[PDB]
Every structure is written in C-alpha cells, then in structure tokens.
Amino acid sequence: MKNMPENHNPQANAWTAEFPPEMSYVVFAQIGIQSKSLDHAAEHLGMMKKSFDLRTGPKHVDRALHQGADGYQDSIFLAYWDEPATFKSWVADPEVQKWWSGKKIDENSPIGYWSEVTTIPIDHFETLHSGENYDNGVSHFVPIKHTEVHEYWGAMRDRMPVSASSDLESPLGLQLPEPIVRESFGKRLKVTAPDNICLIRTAQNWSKCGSGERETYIGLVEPTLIKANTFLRENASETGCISSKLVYEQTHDGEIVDKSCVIGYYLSMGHLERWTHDHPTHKAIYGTFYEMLKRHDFKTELALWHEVSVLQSKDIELIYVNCHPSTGFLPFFEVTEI
Numbered sequence: 001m002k003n004m005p006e007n008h009n010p011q012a013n014a015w016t017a018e019f020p021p022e023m024s025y026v027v028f029a030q031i032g033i034q035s036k037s038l039d040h041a042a043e044h045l046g047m048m049k050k051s052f053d054l055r056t057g058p059k060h061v062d063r064a065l066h067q068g069a070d071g072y073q074d075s076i077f078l079a080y081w082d083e084p085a086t087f088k089s090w091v092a093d094p095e096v097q098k099w100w101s102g103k104k105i106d107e108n109s110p111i112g113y114w115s116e117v118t119t120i121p122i123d124h125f126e127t128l129h130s131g132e133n134y135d136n137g138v139s140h141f142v143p144i145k146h147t148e149v150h151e152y153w154g155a156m157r158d159r160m161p162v163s164a165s166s167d168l169e170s171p172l173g174l175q176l177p178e179p180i181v182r183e184s185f186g187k188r189l190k191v192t193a194p195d196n197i198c199l200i201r202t203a204q205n206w207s208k209c210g211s212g213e214r215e216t217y218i219g220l221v222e223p224t225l226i227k228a229n230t231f232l233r234e235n236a237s238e239t240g241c242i243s244s245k246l247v248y249e250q251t252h253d254g255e256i257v258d259k260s261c262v263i264g265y266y267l268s269m270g271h272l273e274r275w276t277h278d279h280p281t282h283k284a285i286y287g288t289f290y291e292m293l294k295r296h297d298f299k300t301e302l303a304l305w306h307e308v309s310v311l312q313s314k315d316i317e318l319i320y321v322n323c324h325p326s327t328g329f330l331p332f333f334e335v336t337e338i
C-alpha cells in the first residue's frame with residue numbers, strides 16, 4: 001500500500017469486499033424515469049419492477065428517489081449483476097426490450113428515460129464499510145473482510161488493485177471542460193465518456209439508530225451532506241465532478257426508508273480525492289461522524305459505506321431519452337443521437 005502511514009493503527013474498524021476468484025466484473029446499472037410528477041412515472045416503474053424478477057434479473061436492486069434540477073425527479077433503480085453474460089441475456093429478454101432504452105418514450109412525452117450501465121472490472125473496484133454489514137450494495141452477495149487499509153488519505157486508491165500499476169489519470173488531464181446545454185428534450189442521446197472516469201456510490205444508513213444518533217445524523221450531518229452535493233452539482237469545472245446526485249432509498253413499494261446515498265462521477269479518482277481531502281463540507285461531516293464514533297465506543301448504529309470504480313470509456317453505456325439537459329453526462333464530452 002503506497003499511501004499508508006508508518007505504524008498505521010486506525011481508530012475505527014472497517015470492512016471491504018473480498019471478491020471470489022471466478023468473479024471478473026460487476027455490472028452496476030442505474031436506470032431512471034424522469035418526471036415532474038411521480039404519477040406520470042407509475043406505469044414505467046411498474047413494468048420495470050416486474051422485469052427485475054426474471055431469472056436473469058440482478059443479484060441485488062435498490063430503489064431510490066432523486067430531486068433534480070427545476071422540479072424534475074428521477075425514480076431510480078440501482079441494479080447489480082456479478083456476471084456480464086447474465087446481464088446481457090436480461091437486456092435481451094422480450095419483457096425488458098419492451099421498455100429498454102426508452103422505447104416507450106414517444107414524442108412530447110411528459111417523462112424521460114435514462115440508463116447508465118457500468119461494467120466494472122474487479123481490479124478497478126473497491127468497497128469500504130463502517131460495519132460488518134451484508135446489506136451494502138455488493139455486500140448483499142460478496143463476502144467482506146476486516147481491513148487496516150483505511151482512515152488515511154489515499155486509502156481508497158490503495159484498496160483498488162490496479163492503482164499499484166497505474167496512476168488512474170484522465171487522458172483529458174486536470175480540467176473538466178465547461179458544461180454545455182444540450183437540446184436534449186425530445187431526443188435520444190448517447191454520451192461517450194473518456195477513459196479513467198471515477199464513479200462513487202457513498203451511502204448513509206441510519207435505519208438502526210436510536211433517538212440520540214438519529215437526531216444527530218438528521219440535525220447535524222445530513223444538512224451538510226446536502227450542502228456538499230449541491231456544491232458538487234453547481235461547480236463541475238472547479239471540482240471535476242461530472243455529475244452528483246443525492247438520492248433517498250425506497251422500499252419495493254416506493255416508501256422512503258432511512259437510507260440515502262450520493263452517486264457521483266468524477267473526471268478522475270484524483271479529482272474525487274482532492275475534493276474529499278480539501279473541501280470544507282466533507283471536513284465538517286467527517287468530523288461529526290468521528291464525534292459520534294467516540295461517543296459510542298467506536299461502534300455507531302449509523303452505517304456508512306462506499307463503492308468506487310474507475311472506468312474505461314468502453315465500460316460505461318450512457319443513454320438519455322427526453323431528459324432535462326442537466327441530467328447525468330449530458331453537459332459533457334461527445335454526444336450522438338441514437
């Protein structure tokens with residue numbers, strides 16, 4: 001590990017995914033229905049829900065709700081496979097093909113469709129968990145193990161196997177170009193990303209907190225998490241953050257549960273590192289979590305985790321049908337009409 005300090009002894013425990021040898025990829029698919037009122041999205045969401053129960057459906061799927069720009073909401077499925085061939089057979093299923101790639105989105109539709117499908121090579125992937133929790137993304141179906149490789153700047157990079165042999169820099173260098181405003185409503189658009197973009201899903205789960213911890217999380221952490229995500233959304237070029245969403249997770253039936261996450265894409269892992277290590281909003285929430293840890297013998301019922309991947313252009317498929325121009329990758333890079 002390159003960045004680990006001498007005689008490193010972390011204050012808090014943490015766990016990390018330990019992938020079996022036969023696993024080569026994780027498919028992480030984000031599929032969204034975009035609307036101004038959730039009633040408009042009900043029909044699509046019903047169809048997609050049933051598709052996930054196919055024999056080729058994902059090993060795990062979360063539902064979440066995103067409040068986007070200017071009154072648009074995204075109803076999102078976060079779906080995981082451990083076998084790309086199974087994912088491809090799922091997409092090919094006639095029931096999935098009824099709605100895949102926004103097929104039902106007609107002209108002048110009140111809803112949009114988008115999908116961001118990432119096929120993650122395992123050597124370009126790492127996870128971290130504040131507890132031995134088997135309901136955190138891939139930990140629903142991958143074992144996890146205790147690790148010392150955390151609680152220092154650069155630990156995320158060190159946990160990703162390929163960082164020992166690659167700097168993981170963008171071919172575009174250090175500056176994300178100014179966003180542009182696409183005429184994206186009424187169109188079917190595919191965006192091509194540059195190599196070595198970095199995707200993070202970083203999650204907060206207060207479902208097991210008693211009153212004390214819950215009041216602290218809601219009163220003292222979440223407001224600054226909201227501030228952090230807003231800053232990332234509004235300052236793409238300064239930060240290198242292509243896209244950031246704060247989403248609240250839901251039951252199968254759509255009810256909001258006590259879980260959230262930020263899903264963000266960055267021009268490179270280095271951009272994500274520099275924001276995390278430097279910005280005051282992450283400074284503030286990091287400090288509060290360690291304040292909670294000390295007050296609870298370094299075992300809070302609040303659970304945090306993240307999944308971080310570094311992606312090649314060919315690893316990610318980005319499709320936006322009748323979407324608001326601020327959605328996802330639409331402001332950046334190369335676009336084509338499908």
Ligand code: HEM
Binds near residue numbers: 149151155200204
């Ligand atoms: C916009 C939302 C967030 C982003 C993008 C983000 C990003 C990151 C990244 C990339 C790291 C790894 C740093 C490294 O290893 O170099 C990290 C570490 C950490 N973050 Fe966050 N984070 C976010 C929200 C939060 C929240 C809400 C909390 C607490 C409630 C939090 C607490 C921590 C802690 C405690 C660590 C240290 C983990 C360890 O290595 O043991 N973060 N964060």
